[PDB]
Design an enzyme around this catalytic site. Structure first.
Site, PDB file in Angstrom:
ATOM      1  N   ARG A 188     -25.807  25.062 -55.502  1.00  0.00           N
ATOM      2  CA  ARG A 188     -24.348  24.964 -55.521  1.00  0.00           C
ATOM      3  C   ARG A 188     -23.905  24.441 -56.876  1.00  0.00           C
ATOM      4  NH1 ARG A 188     -19.771  21.269 -53.172  1.00  0.00           N
ATOM      5  NH2 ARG A 188     -18.361  22.897 -52.347  1.00  0.00           N
ATOM      6  N   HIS A 206     -21.043   8.192 -52.522  1.00  0.00           N
ATOM      7  CA  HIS A 206     -22.318   8.708 -52.996  1.00  0.00           C
ATOM      8  C   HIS A 206     -22.961   7.673 -53.907  1.00  0.00           C
ATOM      9  CE1 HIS A 206     -21.415  12.825 -51.559  1.00  0.00           C
ATOM     10  NE2 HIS A 206     -20.174  12.520 -51.896  1.00  0.00           N
ATOM     11  N   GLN A 230     -25.501  20.953 -57.951  1.00  0.00           N
ATOM     12  CA  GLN A 230     -26.177  20.302 -56.828  1.00  0.00           C
ATOM     13  C   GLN A 230     -27.495  20.992 -56.526  1.00  0.00           C
ATOM     14  OE1 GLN A 230     -23.890  18.965 -53.455  1.00  0.00           O
ATOM     15  NE2 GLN A 230     -25.601  19.226 -52.027  1.00  0.00           N
ATOM     16  N   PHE A 272     -26.785  15.516 -57.014  1.00  0.00           N
ATOM     17  CA  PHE A 272     -25.977  16.339 -57.893  1.00  0.00           C
ATOM     18  C   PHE A 272     -25.873  15.703 -59.265  1.00  0.00           C
ATOM     19  CE2 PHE A 272     -22.014  13.811 -57.502  1.00  0.00           C
ATOM     20  CZ  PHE A 272     -22.230  13.174 -56.290  1.00  0.00           C
ATOM     21  N   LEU A 317     -15.595  10.103 -55.723  1.00  0.00           N
ATOM     22  CA  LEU A 317     -16.867   9.964 -55.034  1.00  0.00           C
ATOM     23  C   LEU A 317     -17.358   8.524 -54.998  1.00  0.00           C
ATOM     24  CD1 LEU A 317     -18.511  13.103 -56.639  1.00  0.00           C
ATOM     25  CD2 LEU A 317     -17.335  12.935 -54.452  1.00  0.00           C
ATOM     26  N   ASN A 364     -25.006  13.705 -49.630  1.00  0.00           N
ATOM     27  CA  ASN A 364     -25.244  13.208 -48.274  1.00  0.00           C
ATOM     28  C   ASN A 364     -24.303  13.889 -47.290  1.00  0.00           C
ATOM     29  OD1 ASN A 364     -22.746  11.521 -47.848  1.00  0.00           O
ATOM     30  ND2 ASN A 364     -23.592  10.320 -49.543  1.00  0.00           N
ATOM     31  N   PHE A 397     -17.216  20.498 -62.417  1.00  0.00           N
ATOM     32  CA  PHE A 397     -17.365  19.519 -61.346  1.00  0.00           C
ATOM     33  C   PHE A 397     -18.805  19.006 -61.293  1.00  0.00           C
ATOM     34  CE2 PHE A 397     -17.213  18.888 -56.446  1.00  0.00           C
ATOM     35  CZ  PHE A 397     -17.219  17.519 -56.616  1.00  0.00           C
TER      36      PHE A 397
END
Length: 164
Positions: A54, A125, A62, A112, A121, A101, A59
């Site tokens: 991903r 995370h 991942q 990521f 985040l 997660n 951004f």
């Protein structure tokens, strides 16, 4: 004293380059040790041969799902998903390495790499490392992502391990 690990990245099988990470074992030892051991493969499983499934430009990238290759799998070295160690370190900009997660205290193997500041985040995370060398390789990877995260070429960890 903080360990350094590397990934050798390939794109549709052709080498792209190496990314190295500093792992913040001084601040998040259980989370750094999980990632370190998965990168060396010393438990019999880990990141070698797995993909970045991903990638969303601007951004993050991942990866780390080495069991189902699509975001549904992966496992930690502890025999079970493990707790959020702490949230001392924040998502401050490109290069930050952070655990993916499925909610509180569900860390496995997915992680990521931020390619921008992602402060929303923070507290959700666990940040445990940062890119040391090869941020330009992460930037080249990013270009094979898309708005919904689908990659237009296969982005693989062709080799990985511990440096220094």
């Amino acid at each position: 004293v903080n360990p350094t690990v590397f990934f050798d990245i390939a794109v549709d099988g052709e080498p792209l380059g190496r990314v190295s990470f500093e792992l913040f074992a001084d601040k998040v030892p259980k989370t750094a040790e999980n990632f370190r051991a998965l990168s060396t493969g010393e438990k019999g499983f880990g990141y070698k041969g797995s993909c970045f499934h991903r990638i969303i430009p601007g951004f993050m990238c991942q990866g780390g799902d080495f069991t189902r290759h699509n975001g549904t799998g992966g496992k930690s070295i502890y025999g079970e998903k493990f707790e959020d160690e702490n949230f001392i370190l924040k998502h401050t900009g490109p290069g930050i390495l952070s655990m993916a997660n499925a909610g509180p205290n569900t860390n496995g193997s997915q992680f990521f790499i931020c390619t921008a500041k992602t402060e929303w985040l923070d507290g959700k995370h666990v940040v445990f490392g940062k890119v040391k060398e090869g941020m330009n390789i992460v930037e080249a990877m990013e270009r094979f992502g898309s708005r919904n995260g689908k990659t237009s070429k296969k982005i693989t960890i062709a080799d990985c391990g511990q440096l220094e």
